[PDB]
Design a protein around this nucleic acid. Structure first.
Lengths: 141, 57, 185, 99, 221
RNA sequence: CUUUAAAUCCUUUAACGAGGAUCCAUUGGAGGGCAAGUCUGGUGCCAGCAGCCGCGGUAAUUCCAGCUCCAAUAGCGUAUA
């Protein structure tokens, strides 16, 4: 600290408050803009209807493409882009079907070589992707 | 061939082998007893680099 | 407004490092030598030893001739000498910190049955306690984590309703006896 | 070296506009424009030019993206054309290496 | 396999005139034969490799890589040391680091936390050592606490015989060599600190070079 | 039998009730961080894995399956404050 007087507390509190607002994580964590721009609306999971499937490509270190779907949520009307995680799990999803999306790992940050995707698909048609991938449950016909 | 980026290609063309019928594994207190025995009283004084539990060089 | 308690707490604390080597080595050695089931028991004993050591440290940072110090320190010392981990020659506030986990784990009922001389092994001792064979002062104990006292060590024997201490036999003895009666009759 | 033909999910296309960022526009032989993608072995091992006979892979859930596989230079391209795979309106315009 | 001492100190130790390295440390004489300490401290001197870090030098025909070895040496009831050596091979670097670590070991002292009962177990005061940007602090702890540290200063403190210590580090601790040298300089400062336990006037006893000069002038030229 | 407004649950107690004691313990991993295979077969910058470095180019310690091993254990993994 700099103020070392016995009657210096208002100045220290105001300076600490100003330098606390002049930050990054406290800045995103205390305004309404960073939570308003969040399509989840301060939620862990969300539901929505899949419109189409897009093959998004990887970055410059590695050569592959990523199988992905586009989701329009019902709670706010926003359109998001969520990755189907496992191998061959895209065939369990079709158009006009509901999924349960979640975060993808780094709290609103592109993870790995997938650009512009911050969400992943957990469940499809009210059953989990892991149960369909491991062959435990079946899609209801 | 077909296409390059076929969804679920490798898992679809993977060879299918079956599980082998084996004896069941002890769990609970006896599992820790077996681990303690095999790791601490069946050992011999050796030198160099100690061998791993799964070393198959 | 319902008449409940809602009072509970955890009895163990997980370690900071999840994958270490030497810590897992002495934990496995403690489990194998004392015949425990999982790491939760040794972590529980470590947690209660840490709580006792923390209380001893915060009373040892204090000054002498303070009546509350003398009082609850003598309470702690009489508890530690009645539980069987301290001696009369070491009735001092600093000698609590010299304790080990071996002293707390040696007053467990499992190792007391094993060292008393009526069990073949410590796993056999846990099986013997769990199948209702012993009793402590006219009262059977179904669990191995019964930390005994100094004044109750010389009263451990076999229970009355057990085939080992004199009583009705079990089920395989009676089944084999009935099979022998059927084969002989 | 060998004459490999088209299969299910593959067809032939003519490069129209040669772009950057490792992608190009190719006109397929079905009558639709697609945004093709340069394969991982097709960035620097071979060089793709304009108005050339290439192998283009189909996409089974979206119908505006593709990817390129091979390239036919002169003689296997004209031998494939002699076999008959395309409408006759399209022109080769003598695709080969220049002097 | 024989001892041919090139220094008069090594010859004097070999001739059984120096009982222990206590007076060698008291008279602050430099030790240049690494096997004097190996004679004084034998089978009770354990060691293990901390980290082998490769370094490279750029030339016209690529990189010339070299291996640098870090080893900790010391008995578990006193002295501790550290040595750094780089060479072309790994085993040569490790054996050179072992010789250089056994060549330069320092004595540590142990104190108490409050009452003076039993054997000493912890660091007597608050000592600090610094090299590079790394700061290492050693704080006394009550009995039975243990070493609360990173694994490398923890193993150095266990090999130095100190059972209880509180620590607090600052700087780039990802570099193992600077961290190890910093905690070594921190633990080596336990005797350079003046405590009121020793304020009485010391007496300067005679040096071995003065005491055994008649033996030395006969045993060597 | 006890408990209870009357039951149920716990405890007590007779008749039955385990040899591969099928009365069959799962959840995540096995390059480093971080405990644990330079094993075998298949695809071959494709499929995919990967919180971060990065791994796949026709001899993969990281993919997909089997064996073996590792961490916790009636519990374990994942996403958000």
């Amino acid at each position: 600290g700099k103020c070392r007087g016995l009657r210096t507390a208002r100045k220290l509190r105001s300076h600490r408050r100003d330098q606390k607002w002049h930050d990054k994580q406290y800045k995103k964590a205390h305004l309404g803009t960073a939570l308003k721009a969040n399509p989840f609306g301060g939620a862990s999971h969300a539901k929505g209807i899949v419109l189409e499937k897009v093959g998004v490509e990887a970055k410059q270190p590695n050569s592959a493409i990523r199988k992905c779907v586009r989701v329009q949520l019902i709670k706010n009307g926003k359109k998001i882009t969520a990755f189907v995680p496992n191998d061959g799990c895209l065939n369990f999803i079709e158009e006009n079907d509901e999924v349960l999306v979640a975060g993808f790992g780094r709290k609103g940050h592109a993870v790995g070589d997938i650009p512009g995707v911050r969400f992943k698909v957990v469940k499809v048609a009210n059953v989990s992707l892991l149960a369909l991938y491991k062959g435990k449950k079946e899609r209801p016909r | 061939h077909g296409s390059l980026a076929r969804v679920g290609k490798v898992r679809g063309q993977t060879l299918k082998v079956a599980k082998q019928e084996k004896k069941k594994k002890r769990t609970g207190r006896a599992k820790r007893r077996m681990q303690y025995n095999r790791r601490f009283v069946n050992v011999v004084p050796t030198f160099g680099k100690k061998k791993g539990p799964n070393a198959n060089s | 407004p319902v008449a409940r308690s809602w009072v509970c707490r955890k009895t163990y604390v997980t370690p900071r490092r999840p994958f270490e080597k030497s810590r897992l080595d002495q934990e496995l050695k403690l489990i194998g030598e004392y015949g425990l089931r999982n790491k939760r028991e040794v972590w529980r004993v470590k947690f209660t030893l840490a709580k006792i050591r923390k209380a001893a440290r915060e009373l040892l940072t204090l000054d002498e001739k303070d009546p509350r110090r003398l009082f609850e320190g003598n309470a702690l010392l009489r508890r530690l000498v009645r539980i069987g981990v301290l001696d009369e020659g070491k009735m001092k506030l600093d000698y609590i910190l010299g304790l080990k986990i071996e002293d707390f784990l040696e007053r467990r009922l499992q190792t007391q049955v094993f060292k008393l001389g009526l069990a073949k092994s410590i796993h056999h001792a846990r099986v013997l306690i769990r199948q209702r064979h012993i009793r402590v002062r006219k009262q059977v104990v179904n669990i191995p984590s019964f930390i005994v006292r100094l004044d109750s060590q010389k009263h451990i024997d076999f229970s009355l309703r057990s085939p080992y201490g004199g009583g009705r036999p079990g089920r395989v003895k009676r089944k084999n006896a009935k099979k022998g009666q059927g084969g002989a009759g | 070296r060998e004459l490999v033909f088209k299969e299910d999910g593959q067809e032939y296309a003519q490069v129209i506009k040669m772009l950057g960022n490792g992608r190009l526009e190719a006109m397929c032989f079905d009558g639709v424009k697609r945004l093709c993608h340069i394969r991982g072995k097709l960035r620097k091992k071979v060089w793709i030019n304009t108005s050339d006979i290439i192998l283009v892979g189909l996409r089974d859930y979206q119908d505006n993206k593709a990817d390129v596989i091979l390239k036919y230079n002169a003689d296997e391209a004209r031998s494939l054309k002699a076999y008959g795979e395309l409408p006759e309106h399209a022109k080769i315009n003598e695709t080969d290496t220049f002097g | 396999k024989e001892w041919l001492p090139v220094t008069k100190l090594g010859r004097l130790v070999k001739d059984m005139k120096i009982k222990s390295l206590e007076e060698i440390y008291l008279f602050s004489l430099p030790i240049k034969e690494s096997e004097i300490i190996d004679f004084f401290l034998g089978a009770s001197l354990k060691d293990e490799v901390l980290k082998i870090m490769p370094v490279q030098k750029q030339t016209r025909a690529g990189q010339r890589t070299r291996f640098k070895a870090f080893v900790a040496i010391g008995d578990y009831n006193g002295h501790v040391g550290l040595g750094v050596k780089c060479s072309k091979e790994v085993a040569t670097a490790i054996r050179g680091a072992i010789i250089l670590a056994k060549l330069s070991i320092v004595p540590v002292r142990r104190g108490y936390w409050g009452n003076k009962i039993g054997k000493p177990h912890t660091v007597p005061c608050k000592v600090t050592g610094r090299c590079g940007s790394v700061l290492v602090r050693l704080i006394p702890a009550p009995r039975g606490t243990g070493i609360v540290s990173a694994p490398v200063p923890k193993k150095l403190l266990m090999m130095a015989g100190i059972d209880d210590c509180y620590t607090s580090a600052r700087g780039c601790t990802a570099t193992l060599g600077n961290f190890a040298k910093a905690t070594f300089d921190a633990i080596s400062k336990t005797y350079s600190y003046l405590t009121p336990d020793l304020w009485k006037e010391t007496v300067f006893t005679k040096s071995p070079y003065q005491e055994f000069t008649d033996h030395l002038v006969k045993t060597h030229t």
